[PDB]
C-alpha cells in the first residue's frame, strides 16, 4: 500500500468552475500522488488548474506570483492515465 508521489512538492489551485464531478476527480489525483492543494491563490501556488478560457484575473495573479503556470485538467488526468509526471507545458493555457 504505497501510492506514487510524482506530484510531491508541487502546490495546485483549482480555479473557476468544473463540469460534473471533475473537481472531485482533480482533488483525488492531486491528493493521491502527494500534491498539495491550496484553498486560495496564495504565494505557494505553482500550478493553476482551469477549464475556463484565459482570465484577466490571471494577469493580476501573475503580479503577486510571477512563476505561476496555468494548466488544463487534462494534464492531471493524463498523469494518472500514464502513472507519471508529464510536462505541464503540453497542457498549458495562454491568452487568445
Amino acid at each position: 500500500p504505497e501510492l506514487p508521489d510524482f506530484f510531491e512538492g508541487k502546490h495546485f489551485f483549482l480555479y473557476g468552475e468544473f463540469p460534473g464531478d471533475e473537481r472531485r476527480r482533480l482533488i483525488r489525483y492531486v491528493t493521491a500522488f502527494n500534491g498539495e492543494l491550496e484553498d486560495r491563490m496564495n504565494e505557494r501556488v505553482q500550478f493553476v488548474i482551469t477549464a475556463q478560457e484565459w482570465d484577466p484575473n490571471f494577469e493580476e495573479a501573475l503580479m503577486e506570483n510571477p512563476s505561476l503556470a496555468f494548466v488544463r485538467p487534462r494534464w492531471i488526468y493524463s498523469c494518472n492515465e500514464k502513472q507519471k509526471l508529464l510536462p505541464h507545458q503540453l497542457y498549458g493555457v495562454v491568452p487568445q
Binding site: P1, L3, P4, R24, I27, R28, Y29, T31, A32, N34, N80, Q83
Partner: protein, 78 residues
C-alpha cells in the same frame, strides 16, 4: 488500476487533530472516499471517534481505514 475504488460512498469527517492525519486523508481520498467539512459535519455517513451531534453515522477509526485498504474493500466497522 492504481487508484482502487474502496471508499466509494463513504462521506467521512476527519478531525484535523487525528494522528497521522495527512497520510490518512491522502489514502482515503486516493481510494475514492469523500471528506466532509466541519461546517457540514452533520451530513457525514462515517465519523471518527469522539463524535458528537451525529449519532446515526457509523463510528470508525484510523485502523478501519487501513483495514479497508488492506482488504481492498469495506470491512466491518471498528
Amino acid at each position: 488500476k492504481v487508484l482502487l475504488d474502496i471508499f466509494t460512498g463513504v462521506r467521512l469527517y476527519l478531525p484535523p487533530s487525528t494522528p497521522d492525519f495527512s497520510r490518512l486523508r491522502r489514502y482515503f481520498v486516493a481510494f475514492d472516499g469523500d471528506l466532509v467539512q466541519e461546517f457540514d459535519m452533520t451530513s457525514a455517513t462515517h465519523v471518527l471517534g469522539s463524535r458528537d451531534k451525529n449519532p446515526a453515522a457509523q463510528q470508525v477509526s484510523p485502523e478501519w481505514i487501513w483495514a479497508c485498504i488492506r482488504k481492498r474493500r469495506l470491512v466491518a466497522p471498528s
